[PDB]
mmCIF file of C-alpha atoms and ligand atoms in Angstrom:
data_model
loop_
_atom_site.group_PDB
_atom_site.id
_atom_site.type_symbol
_atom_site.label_atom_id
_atom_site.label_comp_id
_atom_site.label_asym_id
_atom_site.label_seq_id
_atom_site.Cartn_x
_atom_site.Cartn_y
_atom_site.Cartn_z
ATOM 1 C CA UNK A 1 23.145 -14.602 45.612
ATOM 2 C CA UNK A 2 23.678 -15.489 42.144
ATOM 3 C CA UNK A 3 19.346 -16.249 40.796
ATOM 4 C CA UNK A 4 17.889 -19.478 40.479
ATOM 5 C CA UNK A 5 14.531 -21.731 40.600
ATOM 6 C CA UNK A 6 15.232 -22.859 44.107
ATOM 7 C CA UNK A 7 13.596 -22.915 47.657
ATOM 8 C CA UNK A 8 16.869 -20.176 48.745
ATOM 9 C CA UNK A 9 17.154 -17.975 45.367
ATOM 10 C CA UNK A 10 13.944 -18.500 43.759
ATOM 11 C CA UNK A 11 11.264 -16.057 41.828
ATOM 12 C CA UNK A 12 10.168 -14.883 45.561
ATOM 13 C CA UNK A 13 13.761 -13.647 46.138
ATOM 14 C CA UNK A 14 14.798 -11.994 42.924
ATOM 15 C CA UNK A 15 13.323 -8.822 44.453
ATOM 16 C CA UNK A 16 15.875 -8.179 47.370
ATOM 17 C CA UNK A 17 18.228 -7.641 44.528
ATOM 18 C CA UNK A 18 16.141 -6.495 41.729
ATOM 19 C CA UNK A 19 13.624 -4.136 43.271
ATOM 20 C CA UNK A 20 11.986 -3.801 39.669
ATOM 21 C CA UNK A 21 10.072 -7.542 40.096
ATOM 22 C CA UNK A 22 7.306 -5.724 42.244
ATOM 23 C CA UNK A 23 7.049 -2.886 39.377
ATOM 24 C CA UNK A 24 3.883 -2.654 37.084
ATOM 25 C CA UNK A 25 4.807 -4.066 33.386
ATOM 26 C CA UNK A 26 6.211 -7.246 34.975
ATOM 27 C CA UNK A 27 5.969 -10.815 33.281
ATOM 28 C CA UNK A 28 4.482 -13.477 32.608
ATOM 29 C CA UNK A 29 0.912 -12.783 33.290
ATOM 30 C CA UNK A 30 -2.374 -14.917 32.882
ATOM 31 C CA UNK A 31 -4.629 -14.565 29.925
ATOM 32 C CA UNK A 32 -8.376 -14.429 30.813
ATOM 33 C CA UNK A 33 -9.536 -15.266 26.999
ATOM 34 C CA UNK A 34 -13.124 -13.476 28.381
ATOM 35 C CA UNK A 35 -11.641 -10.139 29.005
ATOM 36 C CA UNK A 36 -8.994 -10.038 26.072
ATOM 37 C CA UNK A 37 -9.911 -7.215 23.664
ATOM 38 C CA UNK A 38 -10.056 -8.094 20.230
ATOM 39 C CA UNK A 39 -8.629 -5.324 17.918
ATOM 40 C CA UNK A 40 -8.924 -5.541 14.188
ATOM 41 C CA UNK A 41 -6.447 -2.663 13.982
ATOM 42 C CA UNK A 42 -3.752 -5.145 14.596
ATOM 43 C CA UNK A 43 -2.036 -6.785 11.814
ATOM 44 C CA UNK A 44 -1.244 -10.224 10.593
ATOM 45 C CA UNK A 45 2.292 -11.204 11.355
ATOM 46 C CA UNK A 46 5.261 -11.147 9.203
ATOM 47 C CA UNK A 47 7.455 -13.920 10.018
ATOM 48 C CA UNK A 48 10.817 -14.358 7.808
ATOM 49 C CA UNK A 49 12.841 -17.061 8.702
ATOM 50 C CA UNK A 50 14.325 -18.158 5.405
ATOM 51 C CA UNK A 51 17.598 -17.081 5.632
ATOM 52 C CA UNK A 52 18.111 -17.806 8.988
ATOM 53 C CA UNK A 53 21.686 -18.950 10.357
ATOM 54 C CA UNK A 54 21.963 -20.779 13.158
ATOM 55 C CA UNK A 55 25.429 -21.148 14.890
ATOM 56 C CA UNK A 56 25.602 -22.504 18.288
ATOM 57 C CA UNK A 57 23.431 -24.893 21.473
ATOM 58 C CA UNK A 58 24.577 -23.869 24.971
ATOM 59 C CA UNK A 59 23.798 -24.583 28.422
ATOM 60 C CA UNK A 60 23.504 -21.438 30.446
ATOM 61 C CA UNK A 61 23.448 -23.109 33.727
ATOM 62 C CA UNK A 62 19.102 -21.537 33.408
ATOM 63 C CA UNK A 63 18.024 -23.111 30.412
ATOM 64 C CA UNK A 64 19.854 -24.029 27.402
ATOM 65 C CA UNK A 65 19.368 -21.261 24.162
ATOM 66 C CA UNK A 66 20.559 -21.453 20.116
ATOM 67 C CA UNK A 67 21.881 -18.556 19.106
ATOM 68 C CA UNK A 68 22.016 -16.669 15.530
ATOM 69 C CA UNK A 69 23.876 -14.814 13.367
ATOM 70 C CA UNK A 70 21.947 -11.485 13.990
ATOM 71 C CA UNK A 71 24.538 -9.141 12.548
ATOM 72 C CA UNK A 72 21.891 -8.760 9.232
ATOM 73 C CA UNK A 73 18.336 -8.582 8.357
ATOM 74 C CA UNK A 74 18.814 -12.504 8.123
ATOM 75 C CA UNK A 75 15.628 -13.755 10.076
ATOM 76 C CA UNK A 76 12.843 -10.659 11.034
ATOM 77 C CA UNK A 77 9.771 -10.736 12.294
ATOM 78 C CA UNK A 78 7.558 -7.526 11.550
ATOM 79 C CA UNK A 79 3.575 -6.486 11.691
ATOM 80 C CA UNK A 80 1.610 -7.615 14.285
ATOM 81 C CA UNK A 81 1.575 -4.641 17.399
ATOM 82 C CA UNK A 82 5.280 -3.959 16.289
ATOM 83 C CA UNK A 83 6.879 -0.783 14.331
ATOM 84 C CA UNK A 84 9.979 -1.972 12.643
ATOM 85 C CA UNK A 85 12.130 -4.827 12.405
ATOM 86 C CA UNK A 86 13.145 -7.126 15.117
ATOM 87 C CA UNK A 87 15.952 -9.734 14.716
ATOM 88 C CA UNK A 88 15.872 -12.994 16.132
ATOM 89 C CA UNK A 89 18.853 -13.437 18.173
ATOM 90 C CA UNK A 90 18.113 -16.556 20.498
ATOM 91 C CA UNK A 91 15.028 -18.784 20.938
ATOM 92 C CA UNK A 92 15.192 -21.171 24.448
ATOM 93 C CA UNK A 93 12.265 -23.138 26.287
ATOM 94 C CA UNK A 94 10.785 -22.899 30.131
ATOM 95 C CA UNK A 95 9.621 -26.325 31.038
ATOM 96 C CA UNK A 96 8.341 -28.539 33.780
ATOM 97 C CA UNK A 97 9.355 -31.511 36.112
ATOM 98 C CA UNK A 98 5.693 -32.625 35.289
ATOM 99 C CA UNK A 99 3.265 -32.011 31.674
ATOM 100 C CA UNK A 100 1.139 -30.363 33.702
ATOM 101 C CA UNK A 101 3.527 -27.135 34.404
ATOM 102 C CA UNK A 102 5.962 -25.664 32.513
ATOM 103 C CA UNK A 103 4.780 -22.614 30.275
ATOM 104 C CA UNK A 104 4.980 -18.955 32.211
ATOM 105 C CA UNK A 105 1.636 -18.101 30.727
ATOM 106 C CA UNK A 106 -1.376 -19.258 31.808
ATOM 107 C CA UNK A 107 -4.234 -19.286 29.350
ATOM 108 C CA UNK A 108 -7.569 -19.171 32.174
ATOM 109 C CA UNK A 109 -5.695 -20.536 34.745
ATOM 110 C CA UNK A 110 -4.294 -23.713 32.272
ATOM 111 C CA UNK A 111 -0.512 -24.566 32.072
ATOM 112 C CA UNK A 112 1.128 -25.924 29.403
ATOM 113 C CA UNK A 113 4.233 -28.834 29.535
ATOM 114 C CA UNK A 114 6.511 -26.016 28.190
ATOM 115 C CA UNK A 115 7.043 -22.502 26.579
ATOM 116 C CA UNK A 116 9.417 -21.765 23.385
ATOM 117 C CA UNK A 117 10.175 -18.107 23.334
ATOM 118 C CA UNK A 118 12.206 -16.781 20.271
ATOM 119 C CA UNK A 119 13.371 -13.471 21.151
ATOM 120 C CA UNK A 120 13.810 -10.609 18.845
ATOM 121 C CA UNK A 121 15.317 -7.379 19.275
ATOM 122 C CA UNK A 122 14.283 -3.897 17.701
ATOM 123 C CA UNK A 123 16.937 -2.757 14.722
ATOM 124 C CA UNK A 124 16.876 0.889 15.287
ATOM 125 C CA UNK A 125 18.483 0.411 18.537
ATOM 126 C CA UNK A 126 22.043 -0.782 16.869
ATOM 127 C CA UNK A 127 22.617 -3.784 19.571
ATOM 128 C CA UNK A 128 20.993 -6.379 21.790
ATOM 129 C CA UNK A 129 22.481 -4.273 24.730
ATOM 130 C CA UNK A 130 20.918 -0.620 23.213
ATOM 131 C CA UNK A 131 17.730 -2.426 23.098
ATOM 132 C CA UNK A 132 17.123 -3.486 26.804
ATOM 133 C CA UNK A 133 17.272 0.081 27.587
ATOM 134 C CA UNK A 134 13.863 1.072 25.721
ATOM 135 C CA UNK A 135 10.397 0.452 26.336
ATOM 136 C CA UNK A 136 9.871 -1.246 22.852
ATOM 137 C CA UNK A 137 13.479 -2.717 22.536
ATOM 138 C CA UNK A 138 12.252 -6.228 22.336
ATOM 139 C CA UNK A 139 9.425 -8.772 20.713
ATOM 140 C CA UNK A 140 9.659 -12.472 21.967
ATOM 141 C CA UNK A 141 6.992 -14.857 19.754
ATOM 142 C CA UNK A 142 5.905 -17.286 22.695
ATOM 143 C CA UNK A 143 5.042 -20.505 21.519
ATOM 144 C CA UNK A 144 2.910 -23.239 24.051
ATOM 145 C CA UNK A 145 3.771 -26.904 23.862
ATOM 146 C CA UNK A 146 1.743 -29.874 24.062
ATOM 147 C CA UNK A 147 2.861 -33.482 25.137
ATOM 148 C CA UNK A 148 1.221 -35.561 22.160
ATOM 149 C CA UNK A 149 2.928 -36.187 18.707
ATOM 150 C CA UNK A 150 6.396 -35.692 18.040
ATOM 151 C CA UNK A 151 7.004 -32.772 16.560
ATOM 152 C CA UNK A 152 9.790 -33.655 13.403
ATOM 153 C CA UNK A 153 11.978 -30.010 13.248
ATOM 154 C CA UNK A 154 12.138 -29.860 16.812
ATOM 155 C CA UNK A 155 14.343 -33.797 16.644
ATOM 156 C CA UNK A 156 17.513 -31.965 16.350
ATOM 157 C CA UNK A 157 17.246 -29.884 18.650
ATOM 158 C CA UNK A 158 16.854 -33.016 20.958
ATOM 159 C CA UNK A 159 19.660 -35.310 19.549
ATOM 160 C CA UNK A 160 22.326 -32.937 20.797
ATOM 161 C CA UNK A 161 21.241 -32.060 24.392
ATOM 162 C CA UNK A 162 23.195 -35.078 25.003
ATOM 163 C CA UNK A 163 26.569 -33.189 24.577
ATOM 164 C CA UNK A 164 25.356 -29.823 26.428
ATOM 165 C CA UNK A 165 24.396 -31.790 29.922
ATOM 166 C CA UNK A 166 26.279 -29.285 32.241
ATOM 167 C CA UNK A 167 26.151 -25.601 32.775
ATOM 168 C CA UNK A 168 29.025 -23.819 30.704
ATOM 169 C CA UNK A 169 28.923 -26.362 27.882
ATOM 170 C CA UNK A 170 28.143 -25.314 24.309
ATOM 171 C CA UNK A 171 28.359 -27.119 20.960
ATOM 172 C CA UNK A 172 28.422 -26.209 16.860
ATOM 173 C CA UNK A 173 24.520 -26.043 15.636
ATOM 174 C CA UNK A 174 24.659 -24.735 12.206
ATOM 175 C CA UNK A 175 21.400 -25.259 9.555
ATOM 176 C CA UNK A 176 18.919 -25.464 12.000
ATOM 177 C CA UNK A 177 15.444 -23.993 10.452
ATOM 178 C CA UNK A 178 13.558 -22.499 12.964
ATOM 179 C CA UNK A 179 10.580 -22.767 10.745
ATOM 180 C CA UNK A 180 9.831 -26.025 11.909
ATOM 181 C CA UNK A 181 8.384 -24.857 15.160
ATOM 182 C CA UNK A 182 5.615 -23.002 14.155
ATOM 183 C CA UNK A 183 2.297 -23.961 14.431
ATOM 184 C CA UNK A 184 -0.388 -23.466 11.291
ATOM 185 C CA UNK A 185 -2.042 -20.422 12.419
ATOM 186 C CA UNK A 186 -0.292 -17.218 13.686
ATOM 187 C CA UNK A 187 -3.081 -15.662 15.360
ATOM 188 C CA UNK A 188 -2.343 -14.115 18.672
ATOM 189 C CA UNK A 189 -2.670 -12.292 21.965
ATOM 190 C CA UNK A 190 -0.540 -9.516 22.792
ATOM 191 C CA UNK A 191 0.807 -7.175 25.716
ATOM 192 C CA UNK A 192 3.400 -4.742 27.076
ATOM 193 C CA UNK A 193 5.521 -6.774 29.888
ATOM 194 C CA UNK A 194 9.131 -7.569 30.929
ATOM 195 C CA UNK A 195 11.525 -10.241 30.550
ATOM 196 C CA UNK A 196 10.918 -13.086 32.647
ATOM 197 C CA UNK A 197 14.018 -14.003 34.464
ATOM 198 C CA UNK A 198 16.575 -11.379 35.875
ATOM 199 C CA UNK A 199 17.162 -8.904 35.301
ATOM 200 C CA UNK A 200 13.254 -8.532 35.078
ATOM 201 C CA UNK A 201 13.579 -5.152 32.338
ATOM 202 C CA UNK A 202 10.226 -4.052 31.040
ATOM 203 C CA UNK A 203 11.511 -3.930 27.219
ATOM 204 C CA UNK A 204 9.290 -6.343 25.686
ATOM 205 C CA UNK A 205 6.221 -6.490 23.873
ATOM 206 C CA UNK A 206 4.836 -9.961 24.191
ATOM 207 C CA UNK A 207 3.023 -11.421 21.394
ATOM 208 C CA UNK A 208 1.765 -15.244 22.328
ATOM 209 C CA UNK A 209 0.355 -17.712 19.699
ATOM 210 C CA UNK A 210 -2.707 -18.908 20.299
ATOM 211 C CA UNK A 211 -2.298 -22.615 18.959
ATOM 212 C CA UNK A 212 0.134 -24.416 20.463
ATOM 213 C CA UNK A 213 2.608 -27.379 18.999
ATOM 214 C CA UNK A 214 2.707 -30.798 19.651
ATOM 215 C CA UNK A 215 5.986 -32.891 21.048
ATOM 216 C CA UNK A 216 5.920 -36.143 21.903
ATOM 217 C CA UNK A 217 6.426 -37.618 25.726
ATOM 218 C CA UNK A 218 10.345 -38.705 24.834
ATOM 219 C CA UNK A 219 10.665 -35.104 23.402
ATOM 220 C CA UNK A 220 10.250 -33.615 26.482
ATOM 221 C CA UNK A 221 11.425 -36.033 28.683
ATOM 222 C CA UNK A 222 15.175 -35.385 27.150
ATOM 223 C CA UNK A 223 14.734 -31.639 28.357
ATOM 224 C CA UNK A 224 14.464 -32.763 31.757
ATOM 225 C CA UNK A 225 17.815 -34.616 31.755
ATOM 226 C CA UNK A 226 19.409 -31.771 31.501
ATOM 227 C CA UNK A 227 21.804 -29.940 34.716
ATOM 228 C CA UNK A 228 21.531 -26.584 36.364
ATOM 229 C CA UNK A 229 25.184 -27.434 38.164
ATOM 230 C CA UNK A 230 28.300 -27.473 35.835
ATOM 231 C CA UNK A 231 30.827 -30.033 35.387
ATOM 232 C CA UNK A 232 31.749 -31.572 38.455
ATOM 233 C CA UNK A 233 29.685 -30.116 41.225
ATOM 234 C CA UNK A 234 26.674 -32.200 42.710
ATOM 235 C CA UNK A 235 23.787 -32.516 40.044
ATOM 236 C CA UNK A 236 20.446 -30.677 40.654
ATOM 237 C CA UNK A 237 18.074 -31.403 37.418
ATOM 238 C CA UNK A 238 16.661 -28.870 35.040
ATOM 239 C CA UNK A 239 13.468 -28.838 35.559
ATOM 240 C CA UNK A 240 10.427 -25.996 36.820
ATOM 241 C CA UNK A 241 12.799 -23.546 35.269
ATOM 242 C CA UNK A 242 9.616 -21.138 35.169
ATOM 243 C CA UNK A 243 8.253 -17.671 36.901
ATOM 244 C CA UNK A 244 4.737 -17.611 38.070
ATOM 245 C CA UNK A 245 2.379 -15.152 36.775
ATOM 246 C CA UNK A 246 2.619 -11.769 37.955
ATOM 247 C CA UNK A 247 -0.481 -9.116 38.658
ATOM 248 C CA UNK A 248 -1.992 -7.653 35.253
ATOM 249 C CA UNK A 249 -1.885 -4.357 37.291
ATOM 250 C CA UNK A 250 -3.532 -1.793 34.302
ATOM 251 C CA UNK A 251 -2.759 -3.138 31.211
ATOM 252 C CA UNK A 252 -4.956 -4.895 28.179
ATOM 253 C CA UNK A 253 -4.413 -7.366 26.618
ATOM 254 C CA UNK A 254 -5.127 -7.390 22.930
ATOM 255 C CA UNK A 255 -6.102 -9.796 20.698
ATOM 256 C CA UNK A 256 -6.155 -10.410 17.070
ATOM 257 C CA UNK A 257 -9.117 -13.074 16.048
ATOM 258 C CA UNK A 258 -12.423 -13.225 17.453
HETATM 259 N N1 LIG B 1 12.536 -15.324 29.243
HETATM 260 S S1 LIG B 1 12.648 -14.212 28.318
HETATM 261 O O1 LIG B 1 12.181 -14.610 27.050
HETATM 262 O O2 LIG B 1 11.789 -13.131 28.791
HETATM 263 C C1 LIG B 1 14.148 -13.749 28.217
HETATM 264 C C2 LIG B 1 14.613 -13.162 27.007
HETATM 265 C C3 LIG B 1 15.958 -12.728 26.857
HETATM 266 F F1 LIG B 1 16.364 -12.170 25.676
HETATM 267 C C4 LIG B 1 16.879 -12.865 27.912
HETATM 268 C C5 LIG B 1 16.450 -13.443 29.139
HETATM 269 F F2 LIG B 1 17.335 -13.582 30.174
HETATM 270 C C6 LIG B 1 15.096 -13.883 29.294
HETATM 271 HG HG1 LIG B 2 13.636 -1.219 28.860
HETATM 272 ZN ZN1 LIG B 3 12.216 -16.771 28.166
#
């Protein structure tokens, strides 16, 4: 049936119709800080967001994502484990009915109240669509969240959830600066692994931050109020829209600070 977070079509479903969830690059995964390998071969990131061009909020019935213009070098994100240029397309959060879940990653066993990925896709492949097809056709930056202080750039963001309560719905978002969701450092772990919901591709090479931002309780509490149904039908919350971690199987995970 058409995927979900529920007791009927939930992550320990998805593989009757996407055999691929039991394969061996599959995400998210925990991160055992002790066994991370630190590589000073890796590079510092490049993160250009200044001419970034936000258009539109929707409500994809999963989460709710802000898209951008990605039809030119407009917002990249280089360095790091990557060859190239990626351009950001979407960002979007996973969160939690309680602070105490939320994030797909683990970091020794620890959740986080939420996850913000910003997903990226590699420009020699053309498209978005070219790009799920290849092993290194897409970098998502994933950012923890805290509950603590409110976090200023991410108040817009918040003020028009109100209008984007039901699956389907969308609304205008332009000059939106995603700068104002990083943290202060851009150190990082890093891994080869798969997109998290269905369908479950193994495109993506993750690259975490290792300090995560601060929102405040109200912040979050907003995301919750949220709908997975559309317009009309009965209302199930959005909330525990996450996957749990998956096996590391034989991979390493890299890191870049010691
Ligand atoms: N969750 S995720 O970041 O791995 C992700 C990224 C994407 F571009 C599309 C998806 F459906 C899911
Ligand atoms: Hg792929
Ligand atoms: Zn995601």
């Amino acid at each position: 049936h058409h995927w979900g977070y529920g007791k009927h079509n939930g992550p320990e479903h998805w593989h009757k119709d996407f055999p691929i969830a039991k394969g061996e690059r599959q995400s998210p995964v925990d991160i055992d800080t002790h066994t991370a390998k630190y590589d000073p071969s890796l590079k510092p990131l490049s993160v250009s967001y200044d001419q970034a061009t936000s258009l539109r909020i929707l409500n994809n019935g999963h989460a709710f994502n802000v898209e951008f213009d990605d039809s030119q070098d407009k917002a990249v994100l280089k360095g790091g484990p990557l060859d190239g240029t990626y351009r950001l397309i979407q960002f979007h959060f996973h969160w939690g009915s309680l602070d105490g879940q939320g994030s797909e990653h683990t970091v020794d066993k620890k959740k986080y109240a939420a996850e913000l990925h910003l997903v990226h896709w590699n420009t020699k492949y053309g498209d978005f669509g070219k790009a799920v097809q290849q092993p290194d056709g897409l970098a998502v930056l994933g950012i923890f969240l805290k509950v603590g202080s409110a976090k200023p750039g991410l108040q817009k963001v918040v003020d028009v959830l109100d209008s984007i309560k039901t699956k389907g719905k969308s609304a205008d978002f332009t000059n939106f600066d995603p700068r104002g969701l990083l943290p202060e450092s851009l150190d990082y772990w890093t891994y080869p692994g798969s997109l998290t919901t269905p369908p479950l591709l193994e495109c993506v090479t993750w690259i975490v931050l290792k300090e995560p931002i601060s929102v405040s309780s109200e912040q979050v509490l907003k995301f919750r109020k949220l709908n997975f149904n559309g317009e009309g039908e009965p209302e199930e919350l959005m909330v525990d829209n996450w996957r749990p971690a998956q096996p590391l199987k034989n991979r390493q995970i890299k890191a870049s600070f010691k």
